[PDB]
């Protein structure tokens, strides 16, 4: 698996609007919907958003999201999560991958 391409956190913001923003908030104390808030996600444990109801894959998945676990898991969720009920086929592009993970990373 060859490394992601550096990312750009502006063409992160356009890609999350386009396709997390369906689901999810960014905003920190944003509101829970579909998905969880996404503030401050990067590089802590999985499934501890409060107030959110998650798949009990996802509440024990165990899993810290740094970037390199988001690179595998935003390729294919449901194939690095079975039983996610996160319904998203995955970025597929690394750029994209990239970009996203870089915008993620400025959710403080
Ligand atoms: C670029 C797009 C997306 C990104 C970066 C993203 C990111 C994430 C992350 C990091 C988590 C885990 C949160 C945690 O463990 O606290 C998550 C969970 C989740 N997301 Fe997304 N997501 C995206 C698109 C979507 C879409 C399109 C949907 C719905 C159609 C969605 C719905 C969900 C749901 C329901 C969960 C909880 C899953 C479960 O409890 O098993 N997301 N997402």
Same mark, same amino acid.
């Given at each position: ?7 750009? $956190?502006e063409?992160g913001?356009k890609? #999350?609007? !386009? ?5 999810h908030?960014?905003?920190? !104390?944003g /509101?829970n ?8 996600? $990067?590089?802590?444990? /999985?499934?501890?958003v409060? %107030? #959110?109801?998650? @798949?009990?894959?996802?509440?024990? @998945?165990? $899993? ?7 690179? $595998? ?7 690095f +999560?079975? %039983?996610?009920? +996160? @319904? #998203? ?9 990239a970009?996203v ?8």
């Amino acid at each position: 698996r060859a490394p992601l391409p550096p990312g750009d $956190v502006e063409r992160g913001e356009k890609l #999350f609007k !386009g396709r997390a923003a369906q689901c999810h908030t960014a905003t920190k !104390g944003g /509101s829970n919907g579909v998905g969880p808030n996404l503030f401050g996600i $990067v590089n802590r444990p /999985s499934g501890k958003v409060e %107030g #959110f109801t998650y @798949s009990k894959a996802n509440a024990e @998945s165990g $899993v810290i999201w740094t970037p390199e676990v988001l690179d $595998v898991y935003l390729e294919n969720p449901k194939k690095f +999560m079975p %039983g996610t009920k +996160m @319904s #998203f086929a995955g970025i597929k592009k690394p750029q994209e991958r990239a970009d996203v993970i870089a915008y993620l990373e400025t959710l403080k």
